[PDB]
Ligand binder design. Structure first.
Ligand SMILES: Nc1nc2c(ncn2[C@@H]2O[C@H](COP(=O)(O)OP(=O)(O)O)[C@@H](O)[C@H]2O)c(=O)[nH]1
Ligand SMILES: [Mg+2]
Ligand SMILES: [Mg+2]
Length: 171
């Protein structure tokens, strides 16, 4: 009891909100500003749908990305809804995840990934639409959640989504 139950990796281009999301989720003491030059691994003890869970989240920032993928079970791929280039990278990153997980499996499934459209509080400046993010995720077989690390909006839903999916798979 109390041990790490799930290993999640953050992926996404710089500036999309990876660190901010993780610090928000884990209720870190300087929730608004904590951002060390060298990324940390973060922990959240929680109860997800009645089951006590302990998430270990790898914050990150090609070959090194492959190590991050081998050493984690679930994935949160973040893009910035105000930056279409970040959305394009996220799609590329999803393919890296699948291909890498395919290598090891010889199983991993796209539902163990969630695409996160962050900075949704910046609605008046979005370059990527909600329906567009939703349709990409549907095309790929993965989750899609819109979040605001700044306001905390939908942050838990985003992270817990991949745990929920993993459990859904067992039956
Ligand atoms: N308005 C807004 N700004 C955000 C949000 N998430 C992150 N930021 C800002 O985006 C910048 C980069 O955030 P950071 O967490 O360091 O991104 P990272 O490089 O992916 O880890 C910082 O100035 C954050 O304050 C959000 O949800 N809304
Ligand atoms: Mg960061
Ligand atoms: Mg550290």
């Amino acid at each position: 009891a109390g041990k790490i139950t799930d290993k999640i990796a953050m992926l996404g281009e710089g500036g999309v909100g990876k660190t901010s999301l993780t610090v928000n989720l884990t209720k870190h003491v300087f929730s608004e500003t904590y951002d060390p030059t060298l990324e940390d691994s973060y922990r959240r003890q929680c109860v997800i749908d009645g089951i006590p869970s302990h998430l270990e989240i790898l914050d990150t920032a090609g070959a090194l990305r492959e190590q991050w993928i081998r050493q984690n079970e679930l994935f949160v791929i973040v893009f910035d809804v105000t930056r279409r280039s970040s959305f394009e990278a996220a799609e590329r990153l999803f393919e890296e995840v699948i291909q890498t997980k395919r290598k090891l499996d010889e199983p991993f499934a796209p539902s163990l990934v969630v695409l996160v459209g962050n900075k949704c509080d910046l609605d008046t400046r979005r370059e990527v639409g909600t329906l567009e993010g939703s349709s990409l995720a549907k095309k790929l077989g993965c989750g899609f959640v819109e979040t605001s690390a700044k306001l905390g909006t939908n942050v838990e839903e985003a992270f817990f989504s991949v745990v929920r999916a993993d459990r859904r798979r067992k039956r």
